């Protein structure tokens, strides 16, 4: 792979008083683009973008039966109100319900979790820390370019889990669709270890091509979280990927 | 009694100077709703809504290997410009590319198409006519109520084909998604035999319920096609199913 820097994308960070990186990958052309080649390859905690590999492993191992199985609220009231109810895989992904996925990771266990992250070649393949929080405050790290590499394999059903698990997780990643494009993606927000950053990783399905993306950006307060999608979509619009 | 007539929906037809039926099914409550019980049970040619069972059968039989397989344009220039190119299952559904599906039906063949439609309990299960056009000008008939019955089976993966086939077709039915709802659906437009009608059938996925819908309306000319979705969405908004 071969990477072109487009610094003009930086205008969209500048005009929103922000700093970060957008990485794009044109699947047809096998060509990548980014505003910052160095930050594109900087590895960070994945935070809730780890729900993608966690979901795959839980499904492949049968910890999750299917996308309709109900995960009961553990009763503890937490600050994000959508978390304080029962969920299935679809809504747990949509609302990024951490406690549900911590429960998955406990059941998967360290041995199988480590084996699967090596099988996926996911980030630095390091799960040091608590098995139920290592993607929030442990040793795992992944860069935006490494998120693309992983997502490309998921798109092609080439990860070493069942085809069914990959199809279900891609259903659960559904974020936006209309007559012009489909976006499958996952947000993240890493706050437990500096630097506080926001993530958005996934892809845009067109009629005749797929554009993979991965972005992260400094997130000193939660009032900037909507800029994850906003800045990405402005880059997508600039490159004429979406209208 | 599982159906309730709500003639107030007729306002959405009349003020678009239209005649037709909208049928809704509340999956959680197992209760149905329509502006017109009699038209709701009136069977019509399925036209392009037949692409849903046709897709399922082609996938189950390996006629279609997956949603990436390319079906080459046969070089015949047809009136709908988007048909005059290569397609896969996703784009052939999106652009309702009849010639692609006519070829599927020839490969499926008469005997296998008949057995599968009986297994599906699809409409009147009658495939009299040409193997590659019976859903356009042959003997098969299906009502809006019978469309709901079939779609419910598909949603629950209870049809008599592989789980994989059903997941792929449901992916191919994706029409709209946002933070509030997901619509999986298929349009239709029956012209070859009177009465000329337009169809929209599918469902709305919410966080905690699924609403199945099937509508048809008199379609004397091609210019009222947009009201298939518009009128349905007015009924959905009235019942507060979508915001
Ligand atoms: C995943 O990264 C986080 C988890 C680490 O808490 C969840 C929570 C959020 S943002 C909710 C904060 N809003 C109000 N301050 C996300 C997210 O990625 O949006 N995932
Ligand atoms: C399926 O119902 C028809 C097929 C029988 O021709 C295709 C074509 C259309 S509408 C295109 C007409 N526009 C221009 N006048 C559809 C559809 O459902 O929208 N499917
Ligand atoms: Ca901008
Ligand atoms: Ca813990
Ligand atoms: Ca109106
Ligand atoms: Ca029957
Ligand atoms: Cl998480
Ligand atoms: Cl989907
Ligand atoms: Cl067709
Ligand atoms: Cl049933």
CB distance from B91 to chain A under 8 Å? yes
- Experimental technique used to determine this entry: X-ray
| Burial grade of A19 (CB within 10 A; 0-12, 13-18, 19 or more) | middle
Chain centroid offset of residue A7 CA: 24
Binding residues of B: 48, 51, 96, 228
B188 backbone dihedrals φ, ψ, rounded to 5°: -150, 160
Q: Which helix (H) or strand (E) holds A135?
A: helix A134-137
CB distance from A167 to chain B under 8 Å? yes
Spatial separation of the C-alpha atoms in residues B57 and B101, rounded to whole Å: 11
For residue A190, the tally of other CB atoms under 10 A from its CB is 22
Spatial separation of the C-alpha atoms in residues A140 and A17, rounded to whole Å: 29
For residue B215, the tally of other CB atoms under 10 A from its CB is 29
The closest-lying atom of ligand 2 relative to the alpha carbon of residue B47 is 2
SS3 label, residue A79: coil
- CB B5 within 8 Å of CB B108: no
Residue A188, ligand 1, Cβ within 6 A: yes
For residue A192, the tally of other CB atoms under 10 A from its CB is 11
* Exposure of B126 in the CB half-sphere (CA atoms within 13 A): 12
Q: Which residues neighbour A56 within 8 Å (Cβ) at sequence distance 6 or greater?
A: A116, A120, A154, A159, A161, A165, A166, A169
Q: For atom 9 of ligand 1, which residue has the closest CA?
A: A189
Q: Where are the beta strands (DSSP E) in A20-157?
A: 20-26, 31-34, 43-44, 142-143
User: Which residue in chain B is spatially nearest to A85 when comparing CA positions?
Assistant: B208
For residue B36, the tally of other CB atoms under 10 A from its CB is 20
DSSP-assigned beta bridge partners for residue B176: B183
- Taking a 5 Å cut-off on Cβ, the residues next to ion ligand 3 are A 12, 234
Put simply, the answer to whether B167 touches A163 (Cβ < 8 Å) is no
For residue A23, the tally of other CB atoms under 10 A from its CB is 27
- For B130-170, what is the HEC assignment? CCCCHHHHCCCCEEHHHHHHHHHHHHCCCCCCCHHHHHHHH
Count of all residues that appear for chain A in the document: 243
Q: What does R_g of chain B's alpha carbons equal in angstroms?
A: 17
Which of B45, B49, B84, B189 to mutate to test ligand 2, by most ligand atoms within 8 A of the CB atom?
B189
Q: B8: which DSSP letter?
A: G
DSSP-assigned beta bridge partners for residue A212: A25, A203
SS3 label, residue A233: helix
Residue ranges of the domains in chain B?
A: 1-243
Which residue, among A40, A32, A41, has the nearest Cα to A3 in the 3D structure? A32
Cα→Cα distances B142→A213, B46, B50, B109, B137, Å: 43, 6, 10, 21, 13
- CB B210 within 8 Å of CB B182: no
Q: Is the peptide bond before B195 cis (omega within 30 degrees of 0)?
A: yes
* Discontinuities in chain A (C→N > 2.5 Å), after residue: none
Spatial separation of the C-alpha atoms in residues B134 and B157, rounded to whole Å: 26
B18 is catalytic: no
Spatial separation of the C-alpha atoms in residues A61 and A111, rounded to whole Å: 13
Residue A80, ligand 1, Cβ within 6 A: yes
Please pick, among A18, A48, A55, A149, the residue that the annotation labels catalytic: A48
Residue A227, ligand 1, Cβ within 6 A: no
Q: Which helix (H) or strand (E) holds B102?
A: helix B98-108
Cα→Cα distances B64→B55, B104, B168, Å: 8, 8, 11
The owner of tokens 């042959």 is B138
A198 backbone dihedrals φ, ψ, rounded to 5°: -115, 150
Assigned architecture for domain A1-243: 3-Layer(aba) Sandwich (3.40)
Residue B96, ligand 2, Cβ within 6 A: yes
Q: For atom 10 of ligand 1, which residue has the closest CA?
A: A189
Residues of B in contact with A182 (CB under 8 A): 174, 177
DSSP-assigned beta bridge partners for residue A204: A183, A211
Measured from the alpha carbon of residue B121, the closest ligand is: 6
- CB A71 within 8 Å of CB A87: yes
- For B35-80, what is the HEC assignment? CCHHHHCCEECCHHHHHHHHHHHHHHCCCCCCCCCCECCCCCCCCC
């Amino acid at each position: 792979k071969e990477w072109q820097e487009n610094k003009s994308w930086n205008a969209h960070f500048t005009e929103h008083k922000s700093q970060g990186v957008v990485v794009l990958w044109n699947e047809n052309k096998q060509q990548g683009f980014t505003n910052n080649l160095k930050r594109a390859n900087q590895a960070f905690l994945p935070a809730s973008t780890f729900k993608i590999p966690n979901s795959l492993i839980a499904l492949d191992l049968g910890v999750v039966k299917d996308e309709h199985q109900v995960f009961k609220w553990d009763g503890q009231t937490r600050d994000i109100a959508t978390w304080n109810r029962d969920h299935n895989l679809i809504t747990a992904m949509k609302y990024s319900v951490v406690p549900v996925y911590q429960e998955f990771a406990r059941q998967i266990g360290e041995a199988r979790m480590s084996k699967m992250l090596h099988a996926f070649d996911y980030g630095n393949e390091d799960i040091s820390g608590n098995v139920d929080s290592f993607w929030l405050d442990g040793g795992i790290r992944i860069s935006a370019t490494e998120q693309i590499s992983f997502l490309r394999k998921l798109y092609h059903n080439k990860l070493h889990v069942s085809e069914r698990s990959q199809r279900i997780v891609k259903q659960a990643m559904l974020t936006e669709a209309n007559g012009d494009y489909i976006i499958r993606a996952k947000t993240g927000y890493s706050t437990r270890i500096e630097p506080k950053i926001g993530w958005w990783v996934g892809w845009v399905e067109l009629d005749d091509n797929v554009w993979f993306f991965a972005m992260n950006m400094d997130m000193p307060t939660s009032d900037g979280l909507g800029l994850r999608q906003a800045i990405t979509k402005e880059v997508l619009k600039q490159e004429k990927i979406i209208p």
